[model samples]
Target chain A: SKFVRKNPKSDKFKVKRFHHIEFWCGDATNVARRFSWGLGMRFSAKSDLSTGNMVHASYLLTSGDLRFLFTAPYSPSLTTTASIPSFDHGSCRSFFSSHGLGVRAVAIEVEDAESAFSISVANGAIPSSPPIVLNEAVTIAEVKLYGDVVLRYVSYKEFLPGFERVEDFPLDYGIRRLDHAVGNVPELGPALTYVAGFTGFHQFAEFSGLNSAVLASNDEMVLLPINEPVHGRKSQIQTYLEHNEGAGLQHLALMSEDIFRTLREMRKRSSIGGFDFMPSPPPTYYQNLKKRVGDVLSDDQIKECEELGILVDRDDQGTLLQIFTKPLGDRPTIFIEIIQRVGCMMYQSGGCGGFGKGNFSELFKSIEEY
Target chain B: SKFVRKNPKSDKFKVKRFHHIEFWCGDATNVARRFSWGLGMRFSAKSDLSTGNMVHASYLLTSGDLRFLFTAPYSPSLTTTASIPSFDHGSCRSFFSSHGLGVRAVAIEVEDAESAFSISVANGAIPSSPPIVLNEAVTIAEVKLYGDVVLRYVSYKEFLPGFERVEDPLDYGIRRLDHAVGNVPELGPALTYVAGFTGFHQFAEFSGLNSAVLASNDEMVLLPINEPVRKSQIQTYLEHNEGAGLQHLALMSEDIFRTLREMRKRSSIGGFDFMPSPPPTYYQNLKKRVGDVLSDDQIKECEELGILVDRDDQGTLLQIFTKPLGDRPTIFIEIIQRVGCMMYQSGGCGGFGKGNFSELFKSIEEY
Candidate 1:
């Protein structure tokens, strides 16, 4: 594997996993419902005005290790007292007013948040806030990224304070974990430089329209595919930047064990609420794609792929099956992707390991057609 | 026969039925889903940016004869030129900022919208907007009511323009809309304007501290106008709503027990709550009042469904109220079942039982 760290023992700041993705929206309850009913995620926890949370109400949902925290400001006014930690309602209000609903922060689980904050600031990243300590439970800090997006580093021993867990509900679809998150930036060079410098991540692979970077700490792996618009071509990245009003998260690729079953379940549940997925590619694309990777997939697998419009791509190591959903909110900004990898190599040492490049062109073609 | 129009020839402005109720909301799509999935209403039509609607997006959902139109502004800076019929996105922004989501307009169908507007103006009613013609489709006009609520009169030859009918997908238990109840500051003037000027005749009324009853026209449709008497639940709603607005809509069903069961199932499915039933003593008193009129089995079924009943010599009425949809305790729903026989005291009499009103008052005092 060519995707290994240069020197793992010498790395100072280590990211453990994704702590959560926090979404700022107009109605946290309804957004929670959308995720719960539409995505097969369970409503695991919550904090509201009734729970003595004076600033904003929050709903926490979980599917496997992937956690989503949706927060909504109770009042439009952005002012609050000094004793209380500011939840940054001003940025949230501007984001919601401009982009509807979207991801505000991608909180990362780090070994030491204070160190991570210092390192990121030293590496010339804009600091969002000073390190905040929460009553012996967790220490958190944030750094500004593209637009209003923030990279929150949190060192925690337990869950967030004032949040109480409830019983788990049934999942409509089985999503195991977050496979990767892609960001749409106006210029990819500066973003790649800053993120690589701040997080000590290494470039895992490259494609024509976008750059994929891979980073890992201990056992968890994170892949970030940063993209900018190509001048002469219609690109999904450009479309996202146009509709989102600025650079922000474009989509999250969720890992699934059974892509066919997950896609079918998502298709069925989506019909209940008009939740839309990207339209299927024409029959010719599927027939042509079968010729390219026909030997790797079984007949039934190919038939399922043809029925559900699942995209496929293969490298010397393995094959990856993927499908993308349409934008989730009113704005054509953020969406989701479901992915399954077969016979893929794990990041033990390093090699030419990453997502399928063939899949990228096919996915972009579908998005442009849409 | 007692429900016949008091003087059909003399009445000039006759209301046919409810045209539609427009709700100003933050998210029209999600609200449409709430009705379609949670209440078993069908997603009937939509008008959005994709469909050449540049200003805002709207979703129309239907259950039987009832139609609901939910609109959401695409941007905060509300600006749309005059040639296009104004959707009033500015007022909707303020309403959503203040009250989340609630009813904005209750449009009534009438024989002549222009005549209704003229008659309403002559009766000391506040004129909201002049009559507007929408090509060859419909003629609509508006009159200001309590708070931000507007009573619109529409004369139409077909469905709303730019709206295409969608296939019916589902039905929960609702049959048709029965009556719409509005809470106003003093019901007398509003009541007087509609009954005296709008050609609606007072059907029945009762008074203890304040008064409540039904008013109807040549059509079978009814409007129950309610007013706050003392510092009670009605007063609380008036204050919470900041002024008079639509309080609740009562829907009709053939089977009360089956409707209640469907409602309960819907409640579990979407977490939409139904209001708590009256205390046991209220049901006990109802049984005692009915005497030999209703059997023990009927009473048991009513208790099981939390259905409240009121009977006169004319007929029996059963109803249940749903909790407010949003956090604000301003708007709700009512499911009603009316059973009429010769034993009923007033045949076709359009009164929502006096005994039910007292029980409703007691039950709502908690709000």
Candidate 2:
């Protein structure tokens, strides 16, 4: 696979950072709660029937810099919604109809929205929508990413005014921000190249049928991991591809400072929020784990990881502790990861261990048998 | 109500009781957990990919005599599903596509489903499927109800054999299925349609949506049918549902206050969202309105819990309704408790709160 470094050709423009990740689903209120309650994110804003946005209901929640948006379209019976100049979201019904419950867009705060769209299209990115001024405050533009997902470029002073600010949400699980996002595609190279080319993101790491590349923005605040399915015997990624209908964001990793506390607190709300976590890895991995990632995690911490089902891996820069949730929706696609990194400040990329290469096999083995 | 036995004529045939009710949704696992965790139903059985039923995923849950089933269709992307003799359902996906998520079937446990189906079809009931004996243990038959909903009749020495029994589910205190209500276009004719088939008589009536409670001859099943009389919640439901359909289910609790409190505690974390409390004066003058039904202390407790208390001549009944269950203003859940009411087999003595309909509708309109 060609690891093309389509670094921004002209002037090395700053990519800024992720603003919010959005999902399109059939029931936003119910679906949004998975993250809201699981990660204990604060409900920051909303657009719904109560707010005169009858076409769809959305909840924009936040934890630190991480913003998550969940939107569900009203049935076609909501006729009053059709009269507007048209929602910039295009047809949520069509997106939801095809993808079920999955990510639709990842809004990125950029230096220049107009230039982001122009440069991307100039560099072979398929433009989904042009820059549209929102509420005279936020400039929004989008480009097609893969299978129903659009990457939005926004230059905004504040969140789009169409949403009503919400406050006083109850719980917070110590979640910090988006650690990284992974997308599964039928073929990795094309989508990977497209994303890297559009954003000028450099390859952070790769592992050997391994068939995956970790692409990180120059600042390392935004990481996007792309994985292509390996043929034969229906691997987990292949199952995700089939269930998701096409290339889509497979899972998102949310960072937390205290992983055990985060996992324990998140687990308490899992039943109510409908997040079923993947089973813990087989015995041998944990048995052999002591010497492999030694000293990165204390014996006490590793024992705690064993009890909590947290997977650990390390590289020269540092070690990381992470756990993956079982697919939350009905289909076997789209999950979440809670991760904590130690000593990552030393590395420019802010990531280590080639994105848990050892556990990928063990995690796959656990899920395959499960 | 006439307490109809006094207004009666009877072969006094047995109607048995409710077997289970099923809802068709796009995500059965998540929806089913609403009841599983909120009402604390036992996750008793499932028919899904893990259990070899790839056609659709269905979780059969139980709480006392109450059974609630949530099912979702597998996308036709899986070709092998086409080869199986069609699953008993007549198109689950289309129903979901049309109405979002709402009740699809209410199964009844009977002494014998064969005779029930025979008598049903002979007397105006529309047959959806003939009896298909399962593992020679349970005999199941179906008849069309309203909209995409079906009424199923099941008879057996043992339970249905299709499911793989699940073990050790943590529980909730909500007791059992109290009654189920349906909103339709016309209440009078819908009564006539069901009256002949089940020989049920009217047990109760209310006017917000021209409602009537019809019960099986044995008084085992109490189904309330509502029609849009004017600008009422039923009208809103009918419009949002895109048609007449099953509207709400009533869940009985031995202790309304405890059940409601626990449900309320989880509300902050994605549990039941009940309609807002009634205006202050509704409870402020509760002692004057219901008079002897509730004491000042009981009334104050009701206000704190957002519970409504009213009497049915025989006893005081407590109730509260959750917001619409899905994206549509369609099906929802109601929590109820009856005090000193008579005959569970017979519709409980005025168990249906006719007096509270006005306040409930007024509050629903507030939505």
Top DockQ model: 2
Best by TM-score: 2
Best by lDDT: 2
TM-scores for the candidates: 0.82, 0.89
Tens digit per residue, CA lDDT, model 2, B1-367: 5333343433123567787888876667777766566667777887777777656777877777778888776554642342122253337645765677788888887888887888888889888878877666778888887766788888876135667788654455676787888888888777788777877777744265777777766554788888886568888887778787899898888788888888887776666688988876678667777767677888888989998877755667888998877677788898888877455424465467778867656655665
A26: Cα error in model 2, Å: 1.8
* lDDT by residue for model 2 (A1-370), tens: 4432233332234677778888876667666655566677877787877777767777888887889888776655573442112244346655654556778887788888887889888877888878877667777888888777888888865246667787564677788778777888888888888877767777775432437887777766677888887776567888777767778888888888788988888777565545667787776666667777766767788788888888887665667788898876667778888888877464434565446776766656555664
The residue ranges of model 2 lying beyond 4 angstroms of the native Cα positions read: A1-13, A79-98, A157-159, A207-209, A232-234, A271-274, A282-289, A346-349, A360-370, B1-14, B79-90, B157-159, B205-207, B279-297, B342-346, B357-367
Candidate 1 chain A TM is 0.87
- Worst 10-residue stretch by lDDT in candidate 2 chain B? B79-88
Report, for candidate 2, the interface RMSD. Answer: 2.4
**Model 1, range A1-370, lDDT digits (tens) per residue?**
3433343432348877777888876657656666666677777876764455645768887877889888876544313322224376666666776666789888888888888999888987799877888777788899986678888888975158667676642664677777777788888888877777677665654325554454433343656667677766577677677767788988888877688988888887565653667777766667666676677788779889989878887765567788888777665679888888776455432222245567657756655664
lDDT of 1 by residue, B192-242 (tens): 765655556555442433554444444355666778763577777766566
